Structures are given as C-alpha cells and as structure tokens.
C-alpha cells in the first residue's frame with residue numbers, strides 16, 4: 001500500500017505515499033485498466049473546503065493554529081449562510097500553483113511554483129474578460145521570453161451564471177471546410193470556426209488565421225473580439241539546412257494557452273481560468289503539423305526531401321518527422337521565443353519527479369501523456385514507471401459550452 | 408454492461424463486452440492506475456473450476472457446447488483431478504489453448520497472426536538433452552531459411568512445483584554480456600547476469616560483442632544443463648545502411664528469430680513453465696531498443712559521430728536523426744537477406760484492423776497501450792490515437808521469476 005516505482009534504465013526505485021491522500025476516481029478498476037481513455041450543495045462544499053484549508057495551513061507551517069481554526073469557522077459560517085465562500089488571495093494563489101502541481105498529464109511541472117496568478121474575480125463583462133486576457137497574453141509573451149500565467153475569472157454560482165472562454169486556447173488558427181471536401185487551416189477548430197462565423201466574424205479564409213476570442217460573462221451570450229495582432233507573437237518556420245523549407249509557408253504561434261478547462265479549489269469551480277506557459281517542440285512539429293487529422297504535412301515535406309514514399313519501410317515519414325521538428329526548434333530559437341525540446345523537457349520532469357518523491361512523497365503522472373509522441377524510448381520518461389492518481393486542487397475537462405449554453 | 412473506446416483520428420467508436428469475462432486483477436484500483444508498471448503448487452480446490460471454464464470455452468469455439476462429448480469430457484477431467492490431483496489436455500485443447508494465450512496477450516502488437524501458430528507438443532520430454540533436441544527442431548522449423556514461421560514448443564506442465572521444466576535463457580537466441588574490470592560492458596548488458604551464470608556452469612566464453620549464448624536447460628526440476636545451439640541453425644543478419652557505406656563498419660549484426668522462452672503459459676489452470684514461442688521481429692525492437700537503449704548496446708553516440716551531426720545540443724535532434732538512420736538500416740538489412748521483419752507502420756496498421764475485427768467478432772480485444780505504441784514515432788502510427796482497454800483473459804502468458812532465484816541446487 002506504499003507503492004514502488006522503478007526506473008528501468010537507472011534502477012532507481014521511488015516509494016510513493018502521496019497516493020493515499022488521493023481524492024477522486026481514476027476510471028480504472030481491478031478488472032480493467034482505462035489508462036489510455038482520453039475522457040475516462042452546502043453538504044458537499046464544507047468537507048471539500050476543510051480538506052483544502054487543512055493542506056494550505058499545513059503548507060505554511062500553521063496546522064492547528066488559531067489562525068487555522070478561525071479561518072475554518074469563518075468559512076463554515078460563510079457556507080452555512082451564503083452557500084458558497086470566497087478564497088483569500090493567498091489561498092487562491094496556492095490553489096492554482098497546486099492544481100498545476102497536480103496535473104498528471106503535464107511534463108512541464110518542474111516549473112509549477114513560478115506561476116503568475118492574475119485575480120480577475122472582480123470581472124463582470126465580456127469586454128472586461130477581453131481586457132484581462134489581452135493583459136495576460138502580453139505579460140506571458142514578454143516579447144518572446146515566455147512566463148507562465150493563469151487568469152482566474154469569478155467562480156461558479158448556480159451554474160446559470162458561468163464565466164467561460166469558448167476558445168480551446170487563447171490563440172489558435174481557423175479551420176474551414178471547402179467544396180473541395182478537404183480542409184483549409186486547422187481541422188481541429190472547424191466547428192468553433194463556424195460558431196465564430198455564425199456569430200459574425202469575417203474570416204480571411206487562409207491557412208493561419210488567428211481566431212477571434214469568444215467570451216461569455218455571467219452566463220450571458222458570448223461576444224467576439226480580435227486580439228491585437230501586435231500581441232500575437234508568431235514564428236515563421238524555416239530549416240537550418242533546407243532552404244526550400246520556408247516555401248512550405250508554415251508559421252506557428254509562440255504562446256500555448258489552454259483556456260477551456262475548469263479549476264477546482266476547495267470545492268469551488270472556476271470555469272474560466274486560461275493558463276499558459278511555453279511549448280515543447282513536439283506539440284507543434286509532431287502533433288499539430290503531422291497528425292493525419294491536423295495540418296498533416298508529412299506527404300508534402302517528404303516530397304521536397306525526395307524520399308522514397310513507395311513503401312512504409314523506407315521510414316520516410318520518420319525521416320521527414322525529424323527534420324520538421326528540427327525546424328520548429330531552430331525557428332523559435334532563431335527568433336528568441338522560448339521553447340523546449342522533448343529531451344530537455346523529459347530530463348527536467350525526471351528531476352522534478354525525484355524532487356516530489358523526496359519532498360512530497362510522490363508525483364501523479366500519466367505515462368501515456370508524458371512520453372513524447374516521437375522518439376519515446378530515447379527519452380528517460382519512457383523507462384520511468386509512473387503512478388497516476390487525482391489530487392485536488394485540480395484542472396479538469398468540462399463540456400464545450402455550446403452544447404450546454406442557453407441562448 | 409458495455410464499454411466504449413474511440414479512435415481520436417477516425418472517430419470510430421467500439422463497444423467491448425469481452426471485458427465482462429475477465430476475473431484476474433489488473434494492478435489498478437478506482438484510486439490508482441498502474442498502467443505503466445512493468446510487473447503490477449496448485450491444489451484440486453482451485454483446479455476444477457479453472458478446468459471447467461476453459462473447456463466451456465473450447466467447446467463453444469468448436470460449436471459443441473453442451474454436447475455429449477462436452478459433458479463426458481468435463482466428467483472425465485473431474486475424475487482425473489480428484490484421482491490424480493491434476494489432468495492432461497487433449498492435443499486439440501492444447502493447440503487451442505496456446506493460440507488463445509497468444510490472442511489474449513494484451514502487450515502483443517502482432518496478434519493479427521494469432522490463429523497461424525505451429526504448436527509443438529513436447530509433453531513427452533524427460534531430460535535436458537530431450538529439451539535441447541526439441542528446441543533445435545523449433546528453431547530450424549521457425550527459421551525456415553529466413554521465411555519465418557510462428558511456433559511454440561510446450562514442455563510438460565508443473566506438478567508439485569518441485570519438478571519444473573525451465574528454459575533459463577530469456578530468449579532461445581540472444582548475445583552474451585560481459586562486465587569488464589573497468590566497469591564497461593562488452594556485448595549485451597541485458598544479459599550480463601545470465602551470461603555469468605552460464606560461465607559458472609562451465610561455458611567457455613568467446614568474450615566478443617555478439618556471442619550467441621548457450622541454452623541452459625532444466626528438466627523435471629533437475630539442475631539445468633548447457634548446450635550449444637548448432638551455429639548453422641542460428642540465422643544472423645549483418646547490419647548495413649542503403650546509403651551510408653560506413654555503417655557496415657560499425658560491425659553490427661542481429662539474429663533473425665525472436666523467441667521468448669521465460670514466460671509461463673496457463674491453460675485451464677495448468678501451468679507450463681517452459682513454453683518458448685517465436686514469430687518475427689518488428690524493426691524497432693532491434694533498431695530503437697536493442698541498439699539504442701542506454702542500458703543496451705547504446706550506439707547512438709558512435710552512429711551520430713559518424714554522421715557528423717551537431718552533437719553539442721540536444722535540440723539539434725541529433726539523437727532522433729541517428730535513431731531513424733539506424734532503424735532504416737535494420738529493415739534494409741533484413742529485407743535484403745530475405746529474413747521476415749515488419750516495420751512499425753505496417754505492424755500498427757495491421758493491429759488496428761485486427762483489433763476492430765476482434766470487437767466485431769469477439770466482443771473485444773485487450774490491449775496495453777503503453778506496450779502497443781512503438782518506441783519511436785509514436786503518434787504517426789494509428790495505435791497512438793486508439794483508445795484501448797486492458798484486462799486479463801485466460802489462457803494467458805505470464806511472467807515468472809528467474810529460475811536461479813528459486814531453484815534448489817542438487818549438485
């Protein structure tokens with residue numbers, strides 16, 4: 001019941017005790033493992049609140065102090081009365097840093113404690129949300145020297161007054177279905193792109209159109225807004241040895257900023273909480289560019305390289321994959337936009353795991369997400385056993401608002 | 408109740424009911440997933456149920472469930488168990504059993520082939536020398552001059568746990584590992600311990616980078632014995648690259664026949680502790696893992712040096728570039744010598760088709776995603792995007808401890 005994890009390349013064995021503090025369910029049972037599935041009252045609120053405050057006061061070496069006992073009463077009285085409660089700033093900051101700390105799918109968590117938290121709980125309108133977001137984007141972009149940040153909008157009330165960013169990331173490219181049957185731009189965003197168009201956006205109908213923000217305050221209908229282009233840092237993609245690479249016409253944006261998730265802290269639900277850090281190269285080079293259902297450029301790149309595309313066993317896909325990812329790296333580096341390669345990231349995450357094992361007694365890690373989608377086994381995370389479990393505070397998925405929202 | 412898996416690339420949704428016929432445990436609980444953990448004397452008491460379940464399966468497969476021959480077989484197994492404590496499989500039940508253990512191996516990407524398996528019945532074997540003869544026949548049959556054929560050889564089942572047949576090698580064919588006084592390793596570092604055991608048992612070691620290990624064989628719970636596979640039976644392939652002429656001068660080769668020999672086969676509750684089986688290699692096994700694991704041959708530096716890559720920063724992706732070239736070389740070398748091999752694109756595509764067939768015909772297909780997805784180019788193979796349910800079905804192959812860890816030395 002104290003569990004061991006072995007690294008098979010180093011034989012380093014770590015003992016996990018943090019899992020016993022585990023809260024939610026995984027989706028697995030003793031009969032069936034669901035490891036590779038993508039999506040596997042006043043009465044409820046007080047336990048959740050207490051559980052959170054207890055770990056907060058423990059973290060600041062004040063467990064069982066009068067300041068602890070007092071906050072616990074003050075929160076309880078506020079729930080008994082208002083049916084919700086408000087977090088102190090210090091708790092909000094702790095809660096967000098820790099939700100990132102607990103994110104089992106994030107390889108970048110060595111960074112978890114440098115998070116700039118922007119408290120937007122005073123926001124009331126879409127225009128206000130727009131101001132907050134532009135500010136986050138500029139702050140985080142930092143002219144290419146990216147800094148992690150989250151912006152937190154007001155917490156859920158009766159669930160008819162939700163704040164929501166409808167975008168899946170603050171910045172993403174448009175996707176359009178054509179008469180052709182094919183898809184122009186990013187096919188991941190086809191549906192959102194049509195919701196924007198349906199709302200009244202004028203699409204340039206190109207390959208890399210930055211989507212408009214679609215913002216919903218206090219449960220109202222959402223509203224379109226263009227992010228000032230001078231705030232959207234983008235990198236043209238070239239290759240350090242293939243001169244023709246630039247003619248492929250590829251670019252990507254510098255700032256990854258997930259915006260459709262829900263932050264839960266002490267039973268409280270923050271349904272609009274966009275956060276951002278910086279890219280690992282493979283996210284763009286392998287997934288965004290090469291997934292068959294994304295930009296799908298392997299065919300075209302291989303041609304420019306004059307590889308034998310006649311049989312799979314030439315490994316032409318694999319060969320092209322590497323060059324594309326060399327190119328993503330080289331470009332961001334050339335332009336001084338922060339980016340991390342998969343070797344460095346995974347090495348860092350291993351050191352993070354070791355840190356957490358000795359300091360916290362463990363680290364929840366979803367191996368399926370942690371191992372990069374190229375060159376898996378030449379990264380140390382491949383050989384690392386990982387235990388996956390759910391801790392709060394957390395980031396959780398939540399339904400796309402268009403299936404829910406009342407118009 | 409039914410369970411769905413989705414392919415995120417095609418939106419194809421599958422429904423699994425087969426997991427309902429699982430009972431063995433996974434290592435996971437509702438609070439912890441152990442999906443990436445490598446490793447997460449039976450009495451009459453347990454035995455008849457395990458026998459019954461298996462024979463109910465066998466008899467349904469052959470469309471004879473509830474038949475007179477079905478019922479008589481249950482009754483006869485029942486009587487044999489109570490009289491003798493154990494029972495013997497018929498030849499047909501053994502064949503069906505070994506095939507189904509392959510079919511249910513959730514870590515095998517090659518299962519499209521599950522029904523084409525040559526079963527060698529070595530249940531009459533009594534000595535190590537007898538084991539050696541059986542294994543040679545296996546290797547010559549499976550090898551077939553490069554045109555590989557899947558096969559398994561099944562030595563007598565466990566009785567009291569004191570009379571076990573064991574193949575002490577982890578594969579029938581594999582290279583020696585030698586730890587030097589300077590702390591480096593010559594040959595394969597995966598095989599250092601087993602190599603040391605062989606030497607202690609009397610093996611004269613050539614001490615090279617690719618010495619084919621001797622078979623170390625145990626019959627009927629006796630001290631195991633050494634045997635040299637005849638070299639003319641060991642197909643090996645020198646590794647060269649179609650465009651890099653210096654590649655051959657690295658001096659790499661590999662054997663063509665992968666044959667796992669240290670697993671236990673369970674059929675209707677019986678335990679076959681020596682059951683070596685073989686098919687053919689997926690290229691990444693040798694190219695990615697055997698050559699490129701840091702704990703294995705570890706050739707990335709030597710290779711990349713030769714390619715004159717920028718080795719001064721990881722972000723050149725010099726490792727990734729050399730890895731691809733090494734894998735191209737492995738597949739080129741095998742195909743040029745007409746030894747069967749499969750690339751990872753081809754093997755994963757076939758597996759997805761196998762998997763869907765199995766959902767439609769069988770009601771499911773247990774798969775372990777962590778193992779199925781190849782250790783290079785993960786997401787450009789269709790399995791990466793395929794959700795999978797992992798669970799334990801019988802008949803099965805299982806791990807078992809290395810025999811030097813349990814064996815009582817006779818002398």
Ligand code: HEM
Nearest residue numbers: 100103105106107108111148149275276277278279280395
């Ligand atoms: C600072 C640099 C960071 C790096 C290099 C990094 C790395 C990654 C990578 C590679 C993924 C997989 C994403 C995908 O495959 O789509 C990921 C997922 C995740 N990251 Fe991090 N991350 C970083 C910062 C952050 C921050 C600041 C937060 C929250 C405050 C965070 C929370 C998460 C969450 C919740 C997921 C899973 C998203 C999902 O399930 O779709 N990351 N991260």
Ligand code: HEM
Nearest residue numbers: 509512514515516517520557558684685686687688689804
């Ligand atoms: C026909 C050619 C075959 C191919 C291309 C194939 C493919 C693979 C690959 C790539 C692995 C992963 C091995 C590793 O990473 O160490 C594997 C594992 C496995 N395969 Fe297959 N296989 C084939 C035939 C068979 C046969 C004939 C059996 C037994 C009847 C079998 C049963 C297994 C089992 C039990 C494992 C798990 C081994 C372990 O956990 O260490 N395979 N196979």
Ligand SMILES: C[C@H](O)[C@H](O)[C@H]1CNc2nc(N)[nH]c(=O)c2N1
Nearest residue numbers: 036037038368369791792793794
């Ligand atoms: C089916 C499978 O779980 C799915 O493809 C996962 C696998 N691993 C992943 N890993 C990361 N980092 N990102 C992803 O989107 C996925 N997709």
Ligand SMILES: C[C@H](O)[C@H](O)[C@H]1CNc2nc(N)[nH]c(=O)c2N1
Nearest residue numbers: 382383384385443444445777778
């Ligand atoms: C800890 C981790 O599960 C381990 O390294 C696994 C991952 N996936 C694998 N997949 C295959 N095919 N072979 C392996 O040896 C491994 N190793």
Ligand SMILES: CON(C)C(=N)/N=C/CC[C@H](N)C(=O)O
Nearest residue numbers: 256258275276277278279280283
């Ligand atoms: C916000 O999370 N971070 C910092 C990150 N690197 N990646 C997030 C998801 C981005 C997505 N994989 C993409 O490729 O755009």
Ligand SMILES: CON(C)C(=N)/N=C/CC[C@H](N)C(=O)O
Nearest residue numbers: 665667684685686687688689692
């Ligand atoms: C026995 O299973 N088969 C046929 C197979 N392809 N792989 C078996 C293990 C081989 C091991 N990974 C190796 O590289 O030697």
Ligand SMILES: [Zn+2]
Nearest residue numbers: 028033435440
């Ligand atoms: Zn699990």
